[PDB]
Amino acid sequence: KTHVQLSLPVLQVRDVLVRGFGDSVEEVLSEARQHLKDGTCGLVEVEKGVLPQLEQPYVFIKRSDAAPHGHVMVELVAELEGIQYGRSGETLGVLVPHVGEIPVAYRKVLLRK
Structure with a gap:
């Protein structure tokens, strides 16, 4: 299917143990998609002070x-x-591993998968 219904757990930035998906734009998009398929992806809502507490590259x-x-x-x-690598609408949040x-x-x- 071109689209998959997911329910992503929303995490508090200070609770996140693994603060990004890897070290390159291509790796983080790859790993984010893998964790989304495996049910092991969390979502942090972006506010003031959140992104500096996470690791670049970011996946939105x-x-x-x-x-x-x-x-x-x-x-x-x-x-x-x-x-940014991609063009889209309003940010719903930044993806992180869920552990x-x-x-x-x-x-x-x-x-969109």
């Missing part, structure tokens, strides 16, 4: 369209030293 989920079955359609955009942190909420998304 961004709104790709204006929401089937409650699932916002999203796609992946990476960022490294202020340059058992307790979430505060869930974010239903339809991931």
Whole structure:
């Protein structure tokens, strides 16, 4: 399927144990997609002071369209030293590995895969 319904656990930035997906734009997009498929991907909502507490390159989920079955359609955009790889809509948050942190909420998304 071109899209997959996922429910992403929303994590508090200070709880995150693994603060990024790797060391290059291509690696972080690769690893983010793998963790999204495996159910091992978390979401941190972006506010003041959040991104400096996480590791670059960043992987964002961004709104790709204006929401089937409650699932916002999203796609992946990476960022490294202020340059983004991909073009999309509003950020829903930054993706991180999930390794058992307790979430505060869930974010239903339809991931363009």
